[PDB]
C-alpha cells in the first residue's frame, strides 16, 4: 500500500519535451520530479491510509439539541415534550464535509448524551429520571400531549434511557428511496399546467423533493412532576459507516443561508496580499 | 491523422472542425441503454433512435467586451426540438445522454479565452430573502438561456417579488469559488489555439430513469476567463453558437400530452 518509489535520472538532451503541454484539452499533465531535474533513487514508505473515505468520515458530529422540561402542568406554554425533524442541515461542520459530493450511500449511527439541572434553589429535591425517545416515521400519528395513547409505541421503535448511565447508541441501514442519497436536486415537485384554475395548483419550492424525508423524534420524561422544575437537554451525534460517494464538487466558500444554496451576507472570503510580496 | 481535425455524425446530421483540441468523455463513460438487471418500471420502452438522436442548434449569442457569461440546462434547452420534445411531453419518464459542441472563431489578431463546464445537478441561488422561492417559469428559460452578474444586488421590487435567480460570476452562481470549477468535466477555448470544444455526457442520476419535465440533470456554464480584445478599438464582438445531440434516448410511460404554463 506504500507509494511508488522514485527513479534515478541523469542529464537529458532530446527531441521529446515532457515539460510542454496544452491545458485546453481538459487534462492534467502527469509529470514526476525525475522528468525535469536529476534525482536519486529513493525507496518510498509513506502511505495514504489515513485519507480514505472511511477514515475521512469516521467521526461523530453533533447535529441537534433538544430541550425538555418537567414540572406540574399549567395551561401556559410548556415543554413537557418536544419534537425534532431529522436532518443534518442544522449545523455546518458535517454539512460542508458531506457536500463535497453529489451522491452518497452509507449506514448510520446515532448516540445520545443527556444532561439536567435545577432551576430554583428552594427545595433541591428530585429523584432519578427516565427518558423516552420515540421515532415516528412519515404518516404515523403524532403526540398531542405528554401522556396520550400515542406513547404506547406498539410498532414504533423507542429507547428508554435512565439518567446517569452510558450514552445510548443505535444503528440504522440505508433507508433511501432511490439507489443513493441526493445532496443536491435541481428540480421541482409539481409542474403548473395551462389548464390549472389558479397558480397554487402547481406552485412549489425550488429544489425540495419531499415533505418529510425521514420523520421526527419525540422526547419526554416518564416520571411524574416533582414539586420543583427540572430542565434537561439531549444532544444527538451522527457517524456514517460503510460509505460510498460519487461526482465530487467544489466545497462551500461563503456562509450558509437556509437549507438551499442561497447566499446573502459576506461574499468576500479572500484577504488582501501584494502581487510581488512573499 | 491529426487530433486537430475531427468529424462527427449522428442521424442525418454531420459536423466538421479543423482547429479542435480533443474530445472529452465525462468520467470516462460512454452512453448506454438500461440493462435488464438494472430496470425498474415493467412497461415496454420506446427508443426512436434516428428520429431524436441528432444535432440541434440553439440561438447564437454575441460575445461583447463587457459580457459576464451564459448558462443553459438540459434537457430543458431541448423542449421544443421536434420529435425529441414531443416524446418528452408525451411520456412520464425519460432518459438520454448528450453530446455538446461549442463554436467560436476569430482571426489571429484577437485574444481571449472561454471556459466550458458541464455540471451535474447545477443548482442556482435566488435573488431575495425568501429561500428557495424562484418559480418554475423563471427557473426554466428554454433555449434562450440565462446570464451571470458581477455582483449580488438584493431584490427590492415593490409590486411583486419577481422570483428569479441572481448568479454571481466569481461564485459560479452557487456559493463556491470559480477557481475550483475545474473538477467538473471542462474544456477551454483559447483563441490562439483552438476554436471549438466537444464534450460527451452520459446519464448521471441516482435512479435508472427519472422524469424529464420536473428534473434537470445537467447544466452548461460558459464564462470568459480572459476578456476579449482587438486592435485599438472597443466595439468588437463575435458570436458564440451551441449545438447539442441526444444519445441513446428511451421513453417509457405513455399518456396524454403535457402543456406547461410559461
Amino acid at each position: 500500500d506504500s507509494l511508488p518509489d522514485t527513479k534515478a535520472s541523469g542529464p537529458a538532451h532530446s527531441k521529446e519535451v515532457p515539460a510542454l503541454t496544452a491545458v485546453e484539452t481538459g487534462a492534467t499533465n502527469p509529470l514526476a520530479p525525475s522528468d525535469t531535474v536529476q534525482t536519486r533513487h529513493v525507496v518510498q514508505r509513506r502511505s495514504r491510509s489515513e485519507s480514505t473515505i472511511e477514515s475521512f468520515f469516521a467521526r461523530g458530529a453533533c447535529v441537534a439539541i433538544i430541550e425538555v422540561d418537567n414540572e406540574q402542568p399549567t395551561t401556559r406554554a410548556q415543554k413537557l415534550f418536544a419534537m425534532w425533524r431529522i436532518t443534518y442541515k442544522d449545523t455546518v461542520q458535517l454539512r460542508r464535509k458531506l457536500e463535497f459530493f453529489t451522491y452518497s450511500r452509507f449506514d448510520m449511527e446515532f448516540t445520545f448524551v443527556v444532561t439536567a439541572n435545577f432551576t430554583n434553589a428552594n427545595n433541591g429535591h428530585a429523584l432519578n429520571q427516565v427518558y423516552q425517545i420515540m421515532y415516528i416515521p412519515p404518516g404515523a400519528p403524532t403526540p398531542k400531549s405528554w401522556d396520550d395513547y400515542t406513547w404506547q409505541t406498539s410498532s414504533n421503535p423507542s429507547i428508554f434511557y435512565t439518567y446517569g448511565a452510558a450514552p445510548a447508541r443505535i444503528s440504522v441501514p440505508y433507508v433511501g428511496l432511490a439507489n443513493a442519497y441526493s445532496h443536491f436536486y435541481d428540480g421541482f415537485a409539481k409542474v403548473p399546467l395551462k389548464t390549472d384554475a389558479n397558480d397554487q395548483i402547481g406552485d412549489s419550492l425550488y429544489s425540495a423533493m419531499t415533505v418529510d424525508d425521514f420523520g421526527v423524534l419525540a422526547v419526554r420524561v416518564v416520571n411524574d412532576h416533582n414539586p420543583t422544575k427540572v430542565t434537561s437537554k439531549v444532544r444527538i451525534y451522527m457517524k456514517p459507516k460503510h460509505v460510498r460517494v460519487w461526482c465530487p464538487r467544489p466545497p462551500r466558500a461563503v456562509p450558509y443561508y437556509g437549507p438551499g444554496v442561497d447566499y446573502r451576507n459576506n461574499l468576500d472570503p479572500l484577504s488582501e496580499k501584494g502581487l510581488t510580496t512573499y | 491523422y491529426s487530433d486537430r481535425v475531427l468529424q462527427l455524425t449522428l442521424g442525418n446530421s454531420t459536423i466538421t472542425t479543423q482547429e479542435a483540441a480533443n474530445s472529452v468523455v465525462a468520467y470516462g463513460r460512454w452512453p448506454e441503454f438500461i440493462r435488464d438487471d438494472e430496470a425498474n418500471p415493467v412497461d415496454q420502452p420506446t427508443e426512436p433512435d434516428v428520429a431524436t438522436c441528432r444535432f440541434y442548434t440553439l440561438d447564437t449569442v454575441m460575445w461583447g467586451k463587457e459580457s459576464k457569461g451564459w448558462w443553459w440546462k438540459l434537457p430543458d434547452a431541448l423542449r421544443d426540438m421536434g420529435l425529441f420534445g414531443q416524446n418528452m411531453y408525451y411520456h412520464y419518464l425519460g432518459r438520454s445522454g448528450y453530446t455538446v459542441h461549442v463554436q467560436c472563431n476569430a482571426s489571429k489578431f484577437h485574444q481571449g479565452a472561454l471556459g466550458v463546464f458541464a455540471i451535474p445537478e447545477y443548482c442556482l441561488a435566488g435573488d431575495s430573502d425568501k429561500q428557495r422561492y424562484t418559480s418554475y417559469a423563471n427557473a426554466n428559460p428554454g433555449e434562450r438561456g440565462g446570464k451571470f452578474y458581477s455582483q449580488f444586488n438584493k431584490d427590492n421590487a415593490v409590486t411583486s417579488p419577481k422570483r428569479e435567480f441572481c448568479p454571481v460570476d466569481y461564485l459560479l452562481g452557487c456559493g463556491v469559488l470559480l477557481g475550483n470549477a475545474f473538477v467538473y468535466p471542462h474544456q477551454i477555448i483559447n483563441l490562439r489555439t483552438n476554436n471549438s470544444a466537444t464534450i460527451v455526457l452520459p446519464y448521471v442520476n441516482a435512479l435508472a430513469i427519472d422524469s424529464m419535465v420536473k428534473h434537470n440533470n445537467w447544466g452548461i456554464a460558459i464564462l470568459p476567463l480572459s476578456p476579449l480584445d482587438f486592435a485599438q478599438d472597443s466595439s468588437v464582438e463575435i458570436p458564440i453558437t451551441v449545438t447539442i445531440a441526444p444519445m441513446c434516448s428511451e421513453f417509457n410511460g405513455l399518456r396524454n400530452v403535457t402543456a406547461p404554463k410559461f
Partner: antibody, heavy 129, light 109 residues
Framework: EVQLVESGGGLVQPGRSLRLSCEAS????????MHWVRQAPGKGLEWVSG????????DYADSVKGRFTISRDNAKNSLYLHMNSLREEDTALYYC??????????????????????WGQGTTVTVSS | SALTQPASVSGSPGQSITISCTGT?????????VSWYQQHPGKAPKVMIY???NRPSGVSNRFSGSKSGNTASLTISGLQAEDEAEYYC??????????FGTGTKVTVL
Amino acid sequence: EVQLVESGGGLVQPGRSLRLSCEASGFNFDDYAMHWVRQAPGKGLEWVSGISWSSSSRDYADSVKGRFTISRDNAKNSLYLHMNSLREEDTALYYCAKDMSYYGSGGVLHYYYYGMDVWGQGTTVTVSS
Amino acid sequence: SALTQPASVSGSPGQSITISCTGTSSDVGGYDYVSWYQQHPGKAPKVMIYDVSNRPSGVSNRFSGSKSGNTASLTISGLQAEDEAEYYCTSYTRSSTLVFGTGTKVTVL
C-alpha cells in the same frame, strides 16, 4: 383548547420604540404561520404583518413597511413585533392571530396565507405626545 | 387598498340577506382563499366561512358563500335578531399579503 395571549401594550411618546409579545399553547406552534392585526378605535380591521413557518418568508403592509419588524422564537412558543419611529396614527388594538396555512396537498411549501381561525383578546397601544 | 363592501344592509326577521365583496385579479378574482368573519361589539372576530364555501364545525347551516368573477358573496338565511353584527371579507393577494374588506353592518328590522 387553543389559546393566544398578548402582552406588552402601553403608552409611549411619538418617535420612540416599543415591543409586543404573544404566547401560544395547545397546538404545535413550531409548525404554523402567524399574523398581526390591528383595529383602530371604531374602525375596521387592518392587516399589519405576517410570518410563515420559515423565518425567511416575512411580509409587511405598506403603512408600516420599513418601521416594524416581526420575528418568532419556536423554543418558547413566542411571537414578537418590534416597532420603531411610532406615530400617533398607530394607536389601535392589536390582535395575535393563528393561520390555518401549511398542510397542503403534500409537495407544496411557503403556502399562501389561507386565513385566520383563532384570535387572541389583544392588547392596547396608545401613542400620544 | 381594502376590498369594496357596502356600508350597511337591513332586513326583516325570517328573510334572506346577501353581502358582496369585490376585488381584482390579484385578489378574490385570482385565488380561492376567501373567508368571512363576524364580530360583536367588544368581542374578537369569529370565522364563519373559509375557502369560499366551507363552514367551520359548530357554525349554523344558515350561512353560505359563493364566488364569481372578481366578486364574492355571503348569504344569510333565516335572519334572526342575534345576527346583528359586523362582517368582513379577507383574501390572499399575489404580492404575498392579506387584505381585509371595508366591513358591513347588518341591521335587523
